[PDB]
Structure formats: C-alpha cells, structure tokens
Design a binder for these strands. Structure first.
Lengths: 99, 141, 49, 72, 107, 216, 97
RNA sequence: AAGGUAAGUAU
C-alpha cells in the first residue's frame, strides 16, 4: 500500500519531470563551460603522477616545524596587576595650585 | 572529515562510547559530503590533536548508520554530541536544544571551550553543562 | 642635545609620561607591558643614566 | 702558487684577498677574523640603517660560495 | 697513552678520554626523563585515521560529491553518475519488541 | 577573396594534431582498446592563422632560495617550443582533455606574436608578469617547420619591428608601443602623445604582449 | 575544503598505496606547509618531493590562493558596505587583508 | 512556532 501512494506521487510529479530535469542539464553544462569541475582542473597533473616510481613515492619526506620551543609551546604568560604608582599618579592629577 | 576516525555501524558507536572512561567522546552524526558537516569536521580536525588528553573525536555516517536516528533525532544536516562514561551530556547552548550541537561552528576555540566545559561538568558528575558562550544569537553586527 | 642641557630632564619626564599613558587605564599586564614599565621606572629612577 | 685556497674559494676572490693582504705569506700570518674583513669598503649609509649597507663585509662575503646562501 | 680519571679514579686510554668525560657524568635523571618520555609515547593513541581509512573516506566522499569529482553531475548527496533495519526509538516500553525484531531478522 | 592584403601579409598556415586523451578513471585494457577504437587517435587538421598565440609559463608563486622575489623570465625559444611534433600541450576542457601538438606549414611574411596574458583563473583575471627573453636582431624558425615545407620556405629569419607592452594590472593598464624605424634602424616608443627614444637593447626588458616580425 | 579533498583524493588515487598508505597523512601535511609558505611569503622548495607531486601541489596552492584573495576582497567589500557579519569572520578577514 | 528542558541518585 505504500508503493501505491509512492507511484501516485511519482505520477503526479511526471507532469514536468522530463521538462525540468532537461533544463537543469543545460544549466549544469552552461555553468561547467565557464567554471569547470575541480577534479578536471587537476586532470593533467593527476595523469602525470603515473611517472612517479615506488622508490620515489617512498622518498617523500616528512614535514617538520621551523619554529622552536619558545614559539611552538610558550610558557604561560602570567598577568600581573598594574603597579600602585599608577593609581597614585592618577590621584595626583586633579590637585590644583591655589595660585 | 577524511582524517578523523570513522564508525561504520551502531555496535562500533556503542563500543566507542563505552570504551572511553576518562575522556569525553565527541561524535559527529552527519555525512562527509554535507557542507555544514565539512565545516564542522574541519574544525574538529583542527582541534583533534589539542584535545587528545581529554577528548576523542569520531565521525558517524547517519545514512550508513541510521541506528540512532530515531532516539537522538539525528535529522539536522550536522550534529555534534558528547558522551562521558556512557552517558549523554547536555549543553545549555541557549539554542533551545540542549541535547546536541546542530550547526557548524567557525572558530576552533569555541569548540575547545565547549569540550573543556563538558569534560569539567561530566567529571564533576553533572549531566548538564552551561556553555561559556550563549548561542541564542550569532552576534552578527 | 648637550650633556649640560637645561631641559634634559623635563623632556625625559615628558617622554616617559607619554610611554606610560598607554597604561593609564587599569588593565592586566603581560610580560612585554611590565618589561616596558620596568624600563620606564628605571629611567625615571636614574634620569642621568 | 695557492692550490688549496683556490680550491676553497674562486681564484678571483683568491687573487683579490692575496693582493690586498700583501702576499701569500702575509695572508697566512693573518688571523682568521681579519681575513673576512679584507677589502671591506666603508660604504657610507645614505640615511638607511647600517645593516642595509652590510657593514664589515669583504671579498669572502661577496665570494661565490658565500653569496650562494640566503641573506640571513 | 693512558690518563687518570678525574671523575672515576681509574686509568683509561687517551683516545676514549673525551667520550669518558662526556658519558661518565650523564645525569641519571636524563635517563629517567627519556624513560618517561618513551612510556607516554608508546601509550599514545591514534588521533587521526590510518592511510587506508583516509583513502576509503576520500573515495566515499568523492562517490557523493559529483560537483567536484566524476564526470556526470547529480545532486550534492546522490551517488548516481527489501530489508529495512529496525532501530530502537529510545523508549523503555519498546525495548522488548525492538529486541525481538532484531532477533527475528537473523536468517 | 582568398588572397587579400591581410592574408598574404599576416596569415600563415599551421597544422594541428588533435588527439583525444582518455579519461584517467578507466581500466588499462579498456584504455588501450579505446585508443584502438580510433575514437582517441590523432587527427591532422590544417588551418590558417593571422597570428601565433604563445602561452607563457606560470608564475613561480614563491620566493627564490637565494634571491628572494626574483622576476620570472623565460627565453623566447622556450615559449616557441609550441608548433612542433616533439612537444605536446594537454588542453583541458570541462568535458575531456585533448592532446593537441601543432606544426607550422607556411610562415607569413609578417609574423604577429600574441603572448597570452590576462588569463582568467577560477575567480578573476590575472596577468602573467613573466619577462620574455627574445632577441631583436636575428632568429631562425627552420627548426619550427616540418621537413616537407622546410624546402619550400627558404627564409625563416624574422626581425622584430613592432612591440606592444602592457604596464599595470589587468584592471587598469596602459599600452605602450616600441616601433623600429625601418629607414634608420632606431627604436622609438610612443605612449599616446609621449614619444621617447628607447635604446634597442632595452626593448626586450619589457612585459611584451604583441609583437610584429619581418622576414625580409 | 573541496579543493583540499579533491587534491588529496587524486594524489592518493595515483599513489601505489598497497605499500605506502602511511604517506597519505604526510601528503596533507605538505599541502599545509606549501599553503603556509605561500601565506607567509617565504620560499617553499621541498628537495625530496617528486616533480609531478610538487607541480600538483603548486597548482593546488595557486587555486587556493586565487580563491583566498577573491574571498578576502569580497568579504572586505561586504564589511565596508555594511553587511552584517560575525566577529570571527571579521578577524579572519583582517588576517587575510 | 520557538530561542523558557536544572542535573543527580532510587525503585
């Protein structure tokens, strides 16, 4: 009984299924004319990988990090309060001469 | 997405949640091809190594593993869920759904904060943790 | 600027005040900021050096 | 005359350091720190910093092997 | 030649003197540090997938994203170009029926 | 008319060997049988051109190890490695790739070289700033002609007489022209109103875009 | 993301991975460093890298750099116009500019 | 229509 309703829905969709799945085909072709697929943009390079031998494949080196310990894993940057002299100096301002 | 470990059936997800006893299991339910899922998975891959001590990240394909779709309501394009000692952990994100994160997060620091908060709360025994950021608004200005 | 300049100290105090104006608003100091403040304080304590 | 030194550095730099040092004997009696400074013109910094003018630089620095290195 | 040790009080060959001083005072806490650095390294898990898993995941992703890979272009999630698994709904009242249906699905 | 004043002056004849490259995601046996099916084989097609389009190498995209930020240069003969049977160019299309090796047949008396700049990448249009290293006095194209037509064309030496150069980014750029005075042999550049006497040697140190050559 | 996935898939497909699966992750690391070396405006020349692999990595870096520049300029113009954007987007765009 | 679910032990 589910198949009956599913076929009914498909039949109702059959009104413009061919006329809208054909227009989207032309739209896809037009879009790909200007903006090709990413895989096709590397097709020639991917083809040229057939000349890399097994020893050459094994000769690929492991990537390391140039920056040293102080940059990769720096110690915790302790935050400290502003010195009391700043409160004192802000407090000195606003005290005005009487003459 | 293609770097994080993948769970291929419901039993594997069961064992992954059961196996970890001192780390929060972070599971992304979704599809590798989903753009939201690709953003979430690349953020997870970015923070995968940093949270090694207190988190393990797995990826589950809901089409391949529809075993938890009914109970966990895994019907959004992307879903991130946290478990601790075989116990689903809820997060007061402010989105109205505390049971999961069902959107892609851009910043990799926010996900680290969420995982850290979940770990703290779950190790304290809580079943709900209040996230450090309220996600009731995307803060777009 | 001569070594016996009549204003060699007033200008130094004015210069150090501008460098400390970035810290006039109270804020948590990191290592670089506190190093700069230490240098300014050392210059103020021994103006001639 | 100087096979080893011409092997290490090109004969052009070899000649330019041997002539300015006063000969092979005088260049061999010269400390290694004073050989790098042979033929170091005191280029006048024209507003630019001293580092841009590359101070304390001689034939050795401008030789082929040294110039085949990144500036840092 | 032979030399007296300023660190051990013994006679040693002259050729081994440099190495003798270099490794005669190797701080044992260096060995302890290396040991604890290797004990943690062995116990470390694999955060990322192995090469086979990465390759299989990449091929599975390519089989769906036909707007990047392949020749023909279907929708984003479609692969182009019986039995339905019974799953628990998470309710304690339906544990028994779901379990029996899982049992009843075994051939 | 077949032979107008533009055909006999600028138009030459070139031969193209268009081979269809099979899709990489195919079995090796299937690949070789498709090659045998004559669907993926060379098809010699003659054609005529008003100018020769010269593709430039891609920018280095990185600093050099020793001399950081070195201007990219390429010898002209490397650019003119096109139009011969030895070399091939994998022309990529959204449908399938093709292998199109060219072969010159008839060299026009006046040969126009159009260097390919202002290439539209996937997101915008960018100019290739590679400096073309070409001589301005004497060349020889005998190596760029097929053996059948080498006897027919006894002359293969061309002299640069006109040069176009584009200064600035493709968004907004100026077009300067260096012209060789045929009577005197001197080179003069003229940017609109401005006219200056640039030395002939300094002509080749420019980002050339269009050149005109005379076979004499 | 799509460019990285496509390049990695192509490289791993042409890779005779029956013996060298463990290089796969290494490959992605190169695809990072090259990109970083372009973003850091520093020279990138791996000595042991095979020429076809280096050529495709350079093609990937060029495509990603073109997209990067276009996206940075587009986001900057959006922000200048007054488009409503997030803080993380602003920080990333500022870094790109 | 929402962004308004305390969590935890016990049957």
């Amino acid at each position: 009984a589910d198949a009956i309703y599913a076929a009914l829905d498909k039949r109702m969709d059959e009104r413009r299924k061919e006329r809208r799945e054909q227009r989207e085909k032309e739209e896809i072709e037009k879009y790909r004319m200007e903006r090709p697929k990413i895989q096709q943009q590397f097709s020639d390079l991917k083809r040229k990988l057939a000349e890399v031998t097994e020893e050459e494949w094994l000769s690929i080196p492991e990537v390391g990090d140039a920056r040293n310990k102080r940059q990769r894993n720096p110690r915790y940057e302790k935050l400290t309060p502003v010195p009391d002299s700043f409160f004192a100096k802000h407090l000195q301002t606003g005290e005005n001469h009487t003459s | 997405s293609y770097m994080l470990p993948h769970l291929h059936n419901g039993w594997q997800v069961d064992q992954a949640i059961l196996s970890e006893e001192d780390r929060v299991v972070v599971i992304r339910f979704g599809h590798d091809w989903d753009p939201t899922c690709m953003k979430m998975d690349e953020v997870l891959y970015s923070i995968a190594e940093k949270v090694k001590n207190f988190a393990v990240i797995y990826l589950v394909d809901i089409t391949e593993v529809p075993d938890f779709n009914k109970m966990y309501e895994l019907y959004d394009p992307c879903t991130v869920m946290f478990f601790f000692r075989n116990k689903h952990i809820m997060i007061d994100l402010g989105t109205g759904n505390n049971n999961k994160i069902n959107w892609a997060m851009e910043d990799k620091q926010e996900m680290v904060d969420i995982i850290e908060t979940v770990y703290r709360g779950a190790r304290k025994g809580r079943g709900l943790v209040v996230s450090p950021k309220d996600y009731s608004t995307k803060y777009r200005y | 600027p001569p070594l016996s300049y009549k204003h060699d100290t007033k200008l130094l105090i004015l210069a150090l005040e501008r460098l400390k104006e970035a810290y006039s608003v109270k804020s948590r100091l990191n290592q670089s900021q506190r190093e700069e403040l230490g240098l300014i304080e050392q210059a103020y304590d021994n103006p001639h050096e | 005359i100087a096979p080893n030194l011409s092997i290490i550095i090109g004969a052009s730099t070899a000649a330019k350091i041997m002539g300015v040092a006063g000969g092979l004997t005088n260049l061999s009696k010269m400390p290694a720190c004073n050989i790098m400074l042979l033929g170091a013109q005191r280029k006048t910094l024209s507003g630019f910093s001293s580092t841009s003018v590359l101070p304390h630089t001689g034939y050795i620095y401008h030789s082929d092997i040294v110039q085949s290195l990144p500036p840092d | 030649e032979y030399l007296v040790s300023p660190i051990t009080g013994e006679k040693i060959p002259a050729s081994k003197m440099q190495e003798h001083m270099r490794i005669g005072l190797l701080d044992p806490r260096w060995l302890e540090q290396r040991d604890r650095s290797i004990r943690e390294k062995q116990s470390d898990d694999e955060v990322y997938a192995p090469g086979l898993d990465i390759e299989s995941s990449l091929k599975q992703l390519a089989e769906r994203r036909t707007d990047i890979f392949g020749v023909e272009e279907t929708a984003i999630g479609k692969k182009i170009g019986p039995e339905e698994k019974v799953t628990w709904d998470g309710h304690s009242g339906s544990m028994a029926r779901t379990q029996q249906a899982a049992q009843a699905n075994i051939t | 008319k077949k032979k107008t004043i533009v055909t006999d002056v600028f138009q030459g004849s070139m031969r193209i060997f268009t081979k269809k490259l099979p899709h990489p995601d195919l079995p090796a046996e299937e690949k070789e049988q498709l090659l045998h099916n004559d669907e993926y084989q060379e098809t010699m097609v003659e054609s005529t051109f008003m100018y020769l389009t010269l593709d430039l190498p891609t920018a280095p995209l990185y600093k050099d190890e020793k001399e950081q930020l070195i201007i990219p240069q390429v010898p002209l003969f490397n650019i003119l490695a096109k139009f011969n049977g030895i070399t091939e160019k994998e022309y990529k299309t959204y449908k399938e790739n093709f292998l199109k090796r060219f072969q010159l047949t008839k060299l026009p008396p006046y040969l126009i070289f159009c260097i390919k700049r202002f290439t539209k990448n996937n997101f915008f249009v960018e100019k290739n700033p590679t400096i073309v290293n070409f001589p301005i006095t004497n060349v020889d194209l005998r190596e760029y002609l097929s053996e059948e037509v080498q006897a027919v064309h006894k002359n293969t030496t061309y002299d640069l007489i006109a040069n176009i150069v584009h200064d600035g980014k493709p968004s907004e750029g100026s077009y300067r022209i260096h012209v060789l005075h045929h009577g005197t042999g001197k080179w003069y550049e003229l940017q609109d109103l401005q006219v200056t006497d640039i030395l002939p040697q300094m002509i080749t140190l420019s980002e050339a875009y269009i050149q005109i050559w005379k076979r004499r | 993301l799509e460019l990285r996935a496509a390049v990695m898939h192509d490289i791993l497909d042409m890779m005779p991975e029956g013996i060298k699966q463990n290089k796969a992750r290494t490959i992605l690391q190169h695809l990072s460093e090259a990109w970083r070396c372009w973003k850091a405006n520093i020279p990138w020349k791996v000595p042991g890298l095979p020429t076809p692999i280096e050529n495709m990595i350079l093609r990937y870096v060029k495509a990603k750099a073109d997209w990067w520049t276009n996206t940075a300029h587009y986001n900057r113009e959006r922000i200048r116009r007054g488009a409503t954007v997030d803080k993380t987007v602003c920080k990333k765009n500022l870094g790109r500019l």
